[PDB]
Amino acid sequence: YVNDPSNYQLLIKNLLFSPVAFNPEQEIVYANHRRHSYKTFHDRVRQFANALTKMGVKKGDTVAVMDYDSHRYLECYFAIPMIGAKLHMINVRLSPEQILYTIDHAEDDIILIHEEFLPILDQIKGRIDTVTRYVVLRDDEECEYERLLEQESTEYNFPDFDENTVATTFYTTGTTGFPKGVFFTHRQLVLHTMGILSTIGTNASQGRLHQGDIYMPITPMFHVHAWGLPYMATMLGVKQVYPGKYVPDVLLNLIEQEKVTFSHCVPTILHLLLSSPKSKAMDFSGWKVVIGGAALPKALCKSALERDIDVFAGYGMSETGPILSIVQLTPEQLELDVDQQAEYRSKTGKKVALVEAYIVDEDMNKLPHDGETAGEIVVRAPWLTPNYYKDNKNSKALWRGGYLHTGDVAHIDDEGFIKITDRVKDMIKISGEWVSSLELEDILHQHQSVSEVAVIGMPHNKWGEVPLALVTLKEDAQVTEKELLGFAKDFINKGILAREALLLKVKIVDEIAKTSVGKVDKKELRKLH
Amino acid sequence: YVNDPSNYQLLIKNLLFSPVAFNPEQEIVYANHRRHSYKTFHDRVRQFANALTKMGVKKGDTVAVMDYDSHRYLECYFAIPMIGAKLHMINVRLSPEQILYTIDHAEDDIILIHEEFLPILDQIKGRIDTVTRYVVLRDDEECEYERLLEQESTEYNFPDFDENTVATTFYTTGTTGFPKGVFFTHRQLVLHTMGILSTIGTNASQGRLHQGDIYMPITPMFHVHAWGLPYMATMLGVKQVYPGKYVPDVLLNLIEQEKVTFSHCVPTILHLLLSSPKSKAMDFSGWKVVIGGAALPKALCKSALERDIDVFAGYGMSETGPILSIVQLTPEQLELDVDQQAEYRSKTGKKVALVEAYIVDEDMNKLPHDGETAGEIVVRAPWLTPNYYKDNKNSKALWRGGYLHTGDVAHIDDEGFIKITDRVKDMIKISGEWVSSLELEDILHQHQSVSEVAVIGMPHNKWGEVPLALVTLKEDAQVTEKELLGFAKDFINKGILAREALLLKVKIVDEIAKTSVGKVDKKELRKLH
Amino acid sequence: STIEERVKKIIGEQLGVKQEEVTNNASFVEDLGADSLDTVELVMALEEEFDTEIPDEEAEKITTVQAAIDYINGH
Amino acid sequence: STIEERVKKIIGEQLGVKQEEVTNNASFVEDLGADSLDTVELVMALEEEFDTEIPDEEAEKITTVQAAIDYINGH
Numbered sequence A, B: 001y002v003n004d005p006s007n008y009q010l011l012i013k014n015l016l017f018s019p020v021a022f023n024p025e026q027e028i029v030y031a032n033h034r035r036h037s038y039k040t041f042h043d044r045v046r047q048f049a050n051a052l053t054k055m056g057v058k059k060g061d062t063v064a065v066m067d068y069d070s071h072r073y074l075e076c077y078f079a080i081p082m083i084g085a086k087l088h089m090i091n092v093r094l095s096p097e098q099i100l101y102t103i104d105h106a107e108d109d110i111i112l113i114h115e116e117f118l119p120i121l122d123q124i125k126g127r128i129d130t131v132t133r134y135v136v137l138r139d140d141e142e143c144e145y146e147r148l149l150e151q152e153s154t155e156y157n158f159p160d161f162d163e164n165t166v167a168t169t170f171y172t173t174g175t176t177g178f179p180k181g182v183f184f185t186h187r188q189l190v191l192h193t194m195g196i197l198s199t200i201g202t203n204a205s206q207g208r209l210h211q212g213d214i215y216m217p218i219t220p221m222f223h224v225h226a227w228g229l230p231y232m233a234t235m236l237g238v239k240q241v242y243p244g245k246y247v248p249d250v251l252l253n254l255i256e257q258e259k260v261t262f263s264h265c266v267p268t269i270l271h272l273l274l275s276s277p278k279s280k281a282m283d284f285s286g287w288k289v290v291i292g293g294a295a296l297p298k299a300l301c302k303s304a305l306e307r308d309i310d311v312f313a314g315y316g317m318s319e320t321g322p323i324l325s326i327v328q329l330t331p332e333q334l335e336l337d338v339d340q341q342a343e344y345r346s347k348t349g350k351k352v353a354l355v356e357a358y359i360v361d362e363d364m365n366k367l368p369h370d371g372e373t374a375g376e377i378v379v380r381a382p383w384l385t386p387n388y389y390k391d392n393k394n395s396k397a398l399w400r401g402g403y404l405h406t407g408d409v410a411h412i413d414d415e416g417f418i419k420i421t422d423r424v425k426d427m428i429k430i431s432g433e434w435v436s437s438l439e440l441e442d443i444l445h446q447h448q449s450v451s452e453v454a455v456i457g458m459p460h461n462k463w464g465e466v467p468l469a470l471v472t473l474k475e476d477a478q479v480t481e482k483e484l485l486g487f488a489k490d491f492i493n494k495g496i497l498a499r500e501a502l503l504l505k506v507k508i509v510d511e512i513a514k515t516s517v518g519k520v521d522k523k524e525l526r527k528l529h
Numbered sequence C, D: 001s002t003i004e005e006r007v008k009k010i011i012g013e014q015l016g017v018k019q020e021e022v023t024n025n026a027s028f029v030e031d032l033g034a035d036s037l038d039t040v041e042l043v044m045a046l047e048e049e050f051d052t053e054i055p056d057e058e059a060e061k062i063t064t065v066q067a068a069i070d071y072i073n074g075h
Ligand SMILES: *O=P([O])([O])O[C]C([C])([C])[C]([O])C(=O)[N][C][C]C(=O)[N][C][C]SC(=O)[C][C][C][C][C]C(=O)O[C]
Pocket: A218, A219, A220, A223, A224, A227, A246, A266, A268, A269, A291, A292, A293, A313, A314, A315, A316, A317, A318, A322, A323, A324, A325, A431, A432, A433, D035, D036, D037
C-alpha cells in the first residue's frame, strides 16, 4: 500500500493510539480473575500481534473467536483488525449446525475457543475443513492464549492500509433460510465511535457517557461489537470491568465493588437484576443502563426508575452498526413524574448524528410524520453493511430503492420520537435470540397427524416473547400437547433447532381464522388465542 | 456481445443445430408415455425457450431441475443453456437438508420439480428464499411444463455470446463439510462431446458408439450430465429411449422392444438386471453397456460376458467432465478367453484424447509407470472445473501444483492401463452415492456411552461397499447393535443423514488397533474386522 | 396373529399399504413400488419382529410377501 | 421414593449432578450452574413427574431444590 502521509486513513489503530484520553495507570478488570493497567494492555495487544504473525496470519485471513466477555475479547477487538486480518465473531447461542455453517461460510483459518465451549465443537469438529489451529482459552494460568502471548515481544509496527479493508464480520439469524453475514470496515467502525460519542457525550445532564465513567458490558460481546461500546470506552480511557459469564449475583457484586456507572443490557437481564434478593440493599443511584434488546416495557422502566437508575432505550440492529436511535430527555422532561418519565424513556428515541431514518410504505412513498401513520423504517448512515457476504438476491432486497430496509414498522412524532409498532413479518424473538416461525411450522407439520399449524408470538417478561403454536388435528386424531412438545424438542436435541423453542407452548384448536383470500389471520389469531 | 462472425464461439446451440447427422423422422421415446420425432423435439426446445423468456429468465439466471430421465430433462439440457441461463441439476438422492443447502447456495430463480418429489420439497419449502416459481411435472396431460410449452410459438432466435459463459452446475457430496459446486462452460461441454466422440467412435470393432446405435441411459441424468452421453447422442442423431424411473423389468422390456444397443450404468444396476428372472429368455447380444460407477468387479464382468454383452469400464468423476479414461481392447485382446477378457475389461482403462493423467506422490514427484508403484492421479484436460463455486481454500487444494487432484491412488502399466488401488481417504461409497465416515463417527460418538468409534468400508455386490462401524463401549457399558443402529437411523429420519446409512452394520469391539503414533489403523482394522 | 398376518402387517406398516389390501403375491418393487433401499430396512424389521437373523444371501431372495412368509414359517 | 427423593432425582438427571450429592439448599443457577433456559425445561419435568401444572408466577419463584420440594409436597 502506498501511504501518501498527507492522505489520512481512518483505522482502528488510530482509535487505540490516538485516543481522547490515555491514562497509563487506569485499570482493566476481569471479574475476580485479572487486573492490569492500560500500559500492559497496549503491550499485550502488541504481543498478540506478534503471536498472530508467527502463526502465519496474513492480511486477508480470518480469525474466529468463541468465548465470553473478558480482557481477551477486548484484545481481539484490536489486534486482529490492526494486523489487517478479519475478526469473525461467533454467536455461541446458535445451534451447532448453524455454528458449523457459519464457520464454513466465513472460511476461518484459526479458532480461539473457550474451554467450556469445547463440547459444542466436539460434535462438529469432524466437518470443519478450513481451520488449521485451535487455541483453547481458560481462566487460569493454563490458558493457551496466555502462554502464546508470553513468548513474544511487546514491540510491533502496525501496518497502514486502505481504510476500506474489512475489519469484522458476524452472522445474523434474522428470519431466512440460513444465517446471513454482515461486515464492516475500519472506516465504518471509527465513524460509528466518533458519531455516537458526539451524540451521547454532548448531552446536558442525563444519559451521557464521559471520561469519568466506569464501564461494564452486559451484552454478549459477539452481538454486533457489543453495540460498539468497548471501542468507545477505550477511546475515552475509562476503567473497564468485564464480568465473564452473566450471573446476576456476581454482576451485582461487581457493580457494587467496582463502582460501575455505565452499562448496557437487554430487558431480560435488567428484570433478573431487579428481581434478585441481593439487589434490595444496594445503591443503584449512579448507574446508566442503556436498554437496546427489544421494546423496553414501561412497567420495567418504572420499576427501574424507583431505584434511581438512569434507564433509557436505544434502537439498532445487526446490519446497522448497530446504533441508529437513542432517547435523550430535554431538561423540561427531566422534571416529569415517574409515569411520564417511564413513557418517554421506553420509546425507541431520536436518530443519532448522521442518520436519516425515513418512514415509507410498500411503494417507497415517504409517509408523513404526523405521529399515527405507520410504515417501515428505511435508513442511511455512514456505518451500514453494503450487502450480505456471498449473497446477491437478499442483498438486493436489503438495499431496495436506495435505502436500507430495517424490517420494522413504526411511526414518527413531530419532534422526532420513533415508536416501533411491529415487524414486517410474523417472526418471534425469544429473549435476545431470533427464532423463525415458518421453520417451526414446517417441523410441526412433519408430525404424524397435523391439519394446520400456525406459529404466532405472545409477549412475556422473563423472555419478552414466547413462540405460541396453534395446531389443528386431523380427522379422529387426538394427540396431547406433550406429544408435539416432545417432537419439537427432539429436533433441538439433534442440534437442528435453537434452544429458544424449549418454551414453545403449543395449543390445540379446531378452527383457523382466514382472510377473504384465505391467509391465516395471525393478528386476529393473536387476539383470539 | 459483439459477434465478429469470423470469430467462432463453441456453443451448445451449434451442437444441436450443426450435428454430425440429423434425420427429422428419427424418434425420441419416453417409456410407454410419449414418442416424437427430432423435428418436434427442435420445435419443443424453441417453445421452451419462449416460455422461459416469458417467465423473465435473463442471461445470468439459474433454473433448477428435479425429476427423472425423460424427454423434458433432455429439453432442459439444451433450452436453458442456449438462452444463456445456468442449469442447476439437483441430486434428488441427497438428504432434504443438503438439497435445501444446495438450492440456497446456487440461488435458483425457478424450480422444475416432478410430482412425486413434492414431499421432499414440502419439508423444506419454508426455508427457500430465492425461488419465485415452481413448475410441477407429471407424466400425463396434467403436466404444467406441457401446458406452458403449448402456449408458445415454435420460433426463436437463439443469442450468440461468449463461449466461456457458464452452462451447467451441480453439487458433489464428496467428503467435505458441505456439498461443493462444480460448473462447466459451453466450450467445455462442446469439447467434451467432440473429444469423447473421437475417442470411442474411431475404435475398430469393439465398444464403439456410432450413428446406427439406439441409446438408453441408466445413469440418473443429474449426475454430471449423464456422463455427457445425451449430448453425444443428439450430436449423432440416433434414436433415444428414456426409461423414467429405474425398474429392472420395465428396463428389460424397453431394451427388448426398442432394440437398445448402447447404455451406461453402475455395477449395482447391471447386477440387478442380470439377476432378474425376466433376463433369462432375452437376447443380450447387441448391447454395449459402459460401467463407470465404481470398480466394475471381475465376477460381474465374467457373468455379463457369458450373455454376449460388450461390457467395458470407464473412469471419471464430478470435477472432471466427467470422462477421463475408457478401456479399449486391441484386436489381439479380443480373442482371449473369458477370464482374461474379464480381467482386461474391468480395468479403469487408457486415457482419452487430450488427457494427461500423471501419477504423483505427496511431494508432487512423478512416479514411474512401472506397473506396481502407486500414487495419486493428477490430470489436465479441456473440460475440468476451474474451482469450486464460492470457495477459496478447497479450490486451492483442488488445483495444488498446477494439476487437478482426483483423490484416487492407482498404478499405471507400461502400455497405459490404469488400475485404481484405493482412495487418499477413509471414505465409503454405498452404491452410487457418497457417504462420509467422519460424520458417522461423530454422530455415533454423540451416543450415551461410547469410547472409540471408527468407521471403515467393506465390499459388497448389491451395494459395492457397506459402511462398517466399530464401536468400543465404556466401563461397565453394554448396548446392543440395535440401539446404535436405531440411534443412527433417527438422524436419517430427520433429513440429516442420507439413506445410504440404513445398512451401517455396526459391530462392538474392545480393542482398537493403533499405529506407532497412535492413529487408528483403518487398513489393519479392515483386515481384522 | 399367525405368521402370515404378522408378515403382512410388517409389510403394510413399512410400505404404507393397508394390511387388509395386502396380497400374498405382491412384489415389493414392481407392485408396491418399494425402492431397493426401502426393501432393505424392510428385511430389518422382519427380523426384528421374528427375533431372527436373515442372512444376506436369503435377504436378496425375498422380493414378495410370499417369500418372506415361507422363510419365516420355515424357522 | 418420597417427594423429596423424586425432586432431587429430577434435579440430578436434568443438571447431571449425582442425586446422592444433591443438597436441599442448592441453587440452580449459582450453585449447580444451571442456565436460565435449562432451569425452564427443569420446571417442565417437575410437572411431568408430579402430573401437575406449575403456573409461570410460581415457576419463577423456584430457584433451589427446597423451593420445588415445598411447592410439590404442598399439592
Ligand atoms: O441467566 P439466564 O437465566 O440464563 O437468562 C437467560 C438469558 C436471557 C439468555 C440471559 O439474560 C443471558 O445470558 N443472555 C441474554 C441474551 C442477550 O444478551 N442478547 C443480547 C443480544 S440481542 C442483539 O444483538 C440485538 C442487536 C441490536 C441492538 C442494537 C442497540 O440496541 O443499539 C442501541
